[PDB]
Design a protein around this ligand. Structure first.
Ligand SMILES: NC(=O)c1ccc[n+]([C@@H]2O[C@H](COP(=O)([O-])OP(=O)(O)OC[C@H]3O[C@@H](n4cnc5c(N)ncnc54)[C@H](OP(=O)(O)O)[C@@H]3O)[C@@H](O)[C@H]2O)c1
Ligand SMILES: CCc1nc(N)nc(N)c1OCCCNc1ccccc1N1CCC(C(=O)O)CC1
Length: 163
């Protein structure tokens, strides 16, 4: 089982200036609950984007997809392709692909699940933004209710499964 998990603005932005252009504690907790104890696979730019306190993601096996021989920043297992990242795999549990846009594009054809947090923050897409992948007719989804964060932003979760 391969799942993609991401947070996006309503406009579809996932990344800007090497980071995430909002702060949503409730999404961080959701992401931690879904991924704890599992393998997380990410692109190398996302690895380098993590705040140092959070790299590697504690309690998870951190796999980083790169074309380089290895990385200066410690704590990852490097692989040269998504296929190498995914096999061997943890039994009875998802491997989670946690970004960014390039790695989501590689993983989308292989995935069985997508877990999306939508953040109602007004962020018109800018030229260099990383955007969320678009889901085609092979996906069926359900959506939770709109929630209000302690910081005032409205957000909600969408969950998709391959038909
Ligand atoms: N909102 C969210 O949920 C979320 C989640 C994660 C990240 N983000 C944001 O997304 C942005 C980063 O995304 P991104 O698309 O620029 O980068 P990315 O997917 O994180 O990483 C791209 C890197 O992955 C490696 N790579 C890509 N294709 C490969 C392939 N076929 N084989 C081997 N290695 C390959 C390359 O590493 P090398 O250059 O080392 O070869 C490439 O530079 C940041 O803004 C980050 O904050 C947002
Ligand atoms: C939460 C962002 C997010 N949200 C959904 N829904 N999906 C994703 N793929 C995703 O990006 C994860 C990679 C970037 N994380 C990240 C980026 C910037 C600051 C902090 C973090 N971290 C959050 C998770 C914390 C942990 O889990 O311990 C540690 C700090």
């Amino acid at each position: 089982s391969v799942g993609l998990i991401w947070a996006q603005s309503t406009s579809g932005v996932i990344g800007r200036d090497g980071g995430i252009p909002w702060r949503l504690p409730e999404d961080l907790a959701h992401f931690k609950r879904l991924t704890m104890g599992h393998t997380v696979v990410m692109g190398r730019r996302t690895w380098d984007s993590l705040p140092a306190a959070h790299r590697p993601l504690p309690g998870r096996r951190n796999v980083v997809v790169t074309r380089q021989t290895g990385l200066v920043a410690h704590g990852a297992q490097v692989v040269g392709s998504l296929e190498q990242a995914l096999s061997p795999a943890e039994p009875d549990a998802a491997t989670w692909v946690i970004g960014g846009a390039q790695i989501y594009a590689l993983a989308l054809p292989l995935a069985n699940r997508c877990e999306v947090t939508e953040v109602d923050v007004d962020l018109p897409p800018e030229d260099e933004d990383a955007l969320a992948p678009v889901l085609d007719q092979t996906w069926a989804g359900t959506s939770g209710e709109w929630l209000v964060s302690r910081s005032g932003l409205r957000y909600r979760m969408h969950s998709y499964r391959r038909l």
